[PDB]
Amino acid sequence: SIEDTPIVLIGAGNLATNLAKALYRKGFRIVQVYSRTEESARELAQKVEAEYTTDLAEVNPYAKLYIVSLKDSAFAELLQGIVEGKREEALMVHTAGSIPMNVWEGHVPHYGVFYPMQTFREVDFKEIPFFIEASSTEDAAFLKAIASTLSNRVYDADSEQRKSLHLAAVFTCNFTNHMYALAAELLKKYNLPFDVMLPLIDETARKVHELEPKTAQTGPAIRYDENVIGNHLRMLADDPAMQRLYELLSRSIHERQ
Amino acid sequence: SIEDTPIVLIGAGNLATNLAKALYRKGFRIVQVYSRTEESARELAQKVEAEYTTDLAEVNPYAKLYIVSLKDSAFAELLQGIVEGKREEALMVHTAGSIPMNVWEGHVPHYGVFYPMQTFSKQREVDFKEIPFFIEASSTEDAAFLKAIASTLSNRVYDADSEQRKSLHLAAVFTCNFTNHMYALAAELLKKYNLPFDVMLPLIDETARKVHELEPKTAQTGPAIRYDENVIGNHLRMLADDPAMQRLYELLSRSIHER
Numbered sequence: 001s002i003e004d005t006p007i008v009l010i011g012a013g014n015l016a017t018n019l020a021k022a023l024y025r026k027g028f029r030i031v032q033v034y035s036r037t038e039e040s041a042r043e044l045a046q047k048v049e050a051e052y053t054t055d056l057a058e059v060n061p062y063a064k065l066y067i068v069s070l071k072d073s074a075f076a077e078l079l080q081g082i083v084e085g086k087r088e089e090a091l092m093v094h095t096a097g098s099i100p101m102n103v104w105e106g107h108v109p110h111y112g113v114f115y116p117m118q119t120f121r122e123v124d125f126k127e128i129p130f131f132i133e134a135s136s137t138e139d140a141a142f143l144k145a146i147a148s149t150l151s152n153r154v155y156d157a158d159s160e161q162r163k164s165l166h167l168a169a170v171f172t173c174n175f176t177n178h179m180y181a182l183a184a185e186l187l188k189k190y191n192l193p194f195d196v197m198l199p200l201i202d203e204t205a206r207k208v209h210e211l212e213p214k215t216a217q218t219g220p221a222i223r224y225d226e227n228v229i230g231n232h233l234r235m236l237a238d239d240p241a242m243q244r245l246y247e248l249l250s251r252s253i254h255e256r257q
Numbered sequence: 258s259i260e261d262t263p264i265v266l267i268g269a270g271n272l273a274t275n276l277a278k279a280l281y282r283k284g285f286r287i288v289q290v291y292s293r294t295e296e297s298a299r300e301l302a303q304k305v306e307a308e309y310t311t312d313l314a315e316v317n318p319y320a321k322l323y324i325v326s327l328k329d330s331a332f333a334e335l336l337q338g339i340v341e342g343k344r345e346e347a348l349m350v351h352t353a354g355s356i357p358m359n360v361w362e363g364h365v366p367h368y369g370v371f372y373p374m375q376t377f378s379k380q381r382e383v384d385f386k387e388i389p390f391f392i393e394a395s396s397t398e399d400a401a402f403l404k405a406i407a408s409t410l411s412n413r414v415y416d417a418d419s420e421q422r423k424s425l426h427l428a429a430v431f432t433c434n435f436t437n438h439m440y441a442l443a444a445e446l447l448k449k450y451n452l453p454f455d456v457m458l459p460l461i462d463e464t465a466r467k468v469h470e471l472e473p474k475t476a477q478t479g480p481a482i483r484y485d486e487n488v489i490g491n492h493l494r495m496l497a498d499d500p501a502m503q504r505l506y507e508l509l510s511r512s513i514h515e516r
């Protein structure tokens with residue numbers, strides 16, 4: 001029934017490819033693929049038993065869902081040609097999380113954001129989170145049902161919520177890796193190999209699959225053990241920037257008790 | 258033979274719970290557990306089929322090894338209550354990264370540090386096989402004894418001084434404690450926007466696995482490298498509700514940028 005949603009793809013890049021193939025494997029009919037270049041459109045279209053076009057005027061107007069994955073400018077330039085000719089029920093979605101849903105506003109009555117947030121080629125979607133925004137509660141439910149066909153992790157998220165993901169990634173990837181870097185600087189200073197940290201790094205990550213971070217939290221800053229922290233701060237005296245960081249991070253941990 | 262060593266745990270927290278279970282599974286005899294609170298003493302004793310007490314005066318004086326996992330504030334208070342009436346050959350060890358071995362000196366003839374370095378939680382099982390275990394003792398024969406015990410548990414058993422061990426522990430606070438806090442803040446943020454923390458797990462996994470291949474310095478990604486002042490401005494703007502979290506973001510970004 002849901003796999004009886006005729007689908008058109010506008011764009012034949014990597015994400016589009018993965019998405020189309022996974023949809024096709026799940027039982028979905030992909031009726032047609034569009035791409036800027038002949039090669040790209042044909043190639044993907046051959047992988048999912050679909051027609052292909054290079055011309056927006058030849059895009060099938062009667063599908064239920066249109067998945068646009070074009071880059072910013074290209075998407076931009078071509079929005080009106082994408083919109084042109086589509087019947088009222090056509091659901092118009094784009095896959096880029098950074099592009100507000102309101103681009104479709106005034107052009108089509110049924111639209112949304114269909115954002116699969118991916119970690120890095122071919123990727124199976126069963127653990128990849130999907131973030132859904134739509135022009136209506138029914139359009140959202142439909143896109144969520146489409147996405148749940150491919151993934152166990154499907155959520156409502158507006159632009160503000162989608163920004164919070166990338167803010168959270170900064171903490172989770174950038175700031176975490178920096179902690180590894182500061183550890184490495186210290187072990188370099190003290191002439192101790194860094195490889196000893198690797199089991200601690202792995203387990204720190206592994207642990208929060210099972211426990212909430214707040215519960216997984218350990219160390220001297222929980223009770224604010226000054227016998228430890230005071231001494232650690234002293235060893236960092238020669239790097240007052242790193243020392244401030246140690247202090248502020250420890251207070252931040254302690255403020256959560 | 259070495260599994261016949263009767264062991265007492267003085268302290269029943271996260272590290273002690275995990276270390277006790279690993280000893281018990283390897284066939285060691287944990288005779289009893291002491292803790293300041295009945296709930297913690299009992300929970301652990303049931304897991305490792307041991308007696309328990311919350312009174313140091315009731316502590317079994319007949320064991321060969323006493324593993325002490327206590328905060329500083331309980332150490333002094335409780336040191337002589339831990340050490341009196343024991344066998345001359347009993348070994349007293351503590352498990353702290355940043356406490357010198359010399360705490361014991363003058364108090365008991367045999368003593369040492371028995372330090373497994375890993376993040377521990379009671380509700381979470383860990384493979385001891387890959388845990389760095391650092392050993393110091395009052396004599397070579399006591400150190401050989403501790404290492405032999407630790408080697409039944411871990412393939413990574415190392416002799417290290419109090420000075421090396423402090424150094425490792427400082428690096429471990431960054432590596433484990435501050436890293437998990439980054440996860441905690443991300444979770445706080447995601448909750449404020451009605452999103453589950455779990456969406457971060459793939460990225461958490463990638464970030465950790467990356468440093469097996471690359472030096473952390475080489476692995477560093479994100480808008481702080483260039484000091485992308487748009488995204489950084491936008492991000493600071495988002496954290497306006499939380500000045501302390503906002504300042505951390507700024508200094509961490511500043512910090513990446515310098516390096």
Ligand SMILES: [Cl-]
Binds near residue numbers: 311312313314338
């Ligand atoms: Cl007592």
